[PDB]
Amino acid sequence: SSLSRFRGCLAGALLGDCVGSFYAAHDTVDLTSVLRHVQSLEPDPGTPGSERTEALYYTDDTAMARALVQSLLAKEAFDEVDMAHRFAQEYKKDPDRGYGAGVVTVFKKLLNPKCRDVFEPARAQFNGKGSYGNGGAMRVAGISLAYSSVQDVQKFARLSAQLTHASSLGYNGAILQALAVHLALQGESSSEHFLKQLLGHMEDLEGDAQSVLDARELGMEERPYSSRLKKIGELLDQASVTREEVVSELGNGIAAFESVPTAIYCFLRCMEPDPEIPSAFNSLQRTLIYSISLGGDTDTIATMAGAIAGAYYGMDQVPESWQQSCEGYEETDILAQSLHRVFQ
Ligand SMILES: [Cl-]
Ligand SMILES: [Mg+2]
Ligand SMILES: [Mg+2]
């Protein structure tokens, strides 16, 4: 059921943001703590829903994902002016959700009606270089629910990201995240087939003039996302990889290149059980717990891993106790069903 996968995708993103938010300033995270945290959500047997109903507040990740999906539903298509104004109005309505330090400048400029070019604020960020943050990717899952063709997913993931993220390191992260959700919607796959399809798309995109120039300017390997997708392949082939090795090779940072590949690794790794994560947890729950246990950008790596895992496993693996702990879970489910109705 594509409907189950749409609902699972947005629920998975919400879970990642809400559950991961508690650990977003830790840096290093004890898995013992994470397991206690998710256990506090489960009521006594015979009791429906959550022990902590809507107690977990979402952050900027969900606030922007909601605005992006509401824009797609309002216009039945990507509309840069509509989406930019929805981002700016959402920030204005609640500026304290936990936004990036830099991107708030973009919203303040978009709130000025003298600003007519909605892409101009993003271009001015960080001395005209653009943001390479993961804010374009944290919110992009909705693009892959609205556009079925892989060519449209790339085009509109890039344009939606460019409203805040003018660096190719920012917007190619958003494209990679959107492609992972797009692939997850196609259903059962080996890690190898999943990775090879992503590597195929990213090799082509990262050969573009802007992608080569931006990577060169930041002193990075040519085709940096492609290089990290290869590293994911190598890490999946190793018997046992420590969290320290995952973070050393892929990162757990606010940079899109240090978080989007990490999220994809978390999804692929957690297809298999882990001795440190009880078999009581399904694959979606294991992906979120493992993501958060990497520390660093815990709300954002988990929201991206959750979007992919949600699209792949669907609504059957979304636990009622976890979902109903999350602020606005019912609104999130209505948005998912609306995207399915409008676009599928
Ligand atoms: Cl690099
Ligand atoms: Mg956040
Ligand atoms: Mg974050």
Author numbering: 18 to 361
What did the published study say regarding this structure?
Poly(ADP-ribose)glycohydrolase (PARG) and (ADP-ribosyl)hydrolase 3 (ARH3) are the main hydrolases of serine PAR- and MARylation, respectively, thus playing a pivotal role in signal silencing following DNA damage. ARH3 is the only known enzyme to reverse serine MARylation and is consequently responsible for the regulation of hundreds of ADP-ribosylated proteins following DNA damage. In contrast to PARG, the active site of ARH3 contains a catalytic binuclear magnesium centre. To understand the impact of the ARH3:substrate interaction on reaction efficiency, we crystallised ARH3 in complex with the chemically synthesised substrates: histone H2B peptide (aa 1–11) MARylated on Ser7 (H2BS7mar), dimeric ADP-ribose (dimer) and α-NAD+.
Therefore, we chose to crystallise the hARH3 E41A substrate complexes as this prevents substrate cleavage during crystal formation, while retaining a functionally relevant magnesium coordination. Interestingly, while we observe an open conformation in the H2BS7mar- and α-NAD+-bound structures, both the hARH3:dimer and LchARH3:meADPr complexes adopt a closed conformation. In contrast, the ADPra1:n unit of the dimer binds in a relaxed conformation within the ligand site, which prevents engagement of the scissile bond with the Mg2+ ions. Similar to the peptide substrate, the ADPra1:n-1 makes only water-mediated contacts with the protein. The axial position of MgII is occupied by a water molecule (w610) due to the E41A mutation that was introduced to allow crystallisation. However, the protein backbone adopts a closed conformation, and our models suggest an interaction between Glu41 and MgII is possible. Within our hARH3:dimer structure, crystal packing does not impact the positioning of the ADPra1:n-1 moiety. Both ADPr groups of the dimeric PAR adopt a relaxed conformation and do not engage with the MgII centre to displace Glu41. The most likely reason for this unproductive binding mode is the strained position the ADPra1:n-1 would need to adopt as well as the lack of a further coordination groups (like the serine backbone carbonyl) to stabilise the binding. Yet PAR binding fails to efficiently induce these structural in ARH3, thus providing a structural explanation for the observed low hydrolytic activity towards this substrate.
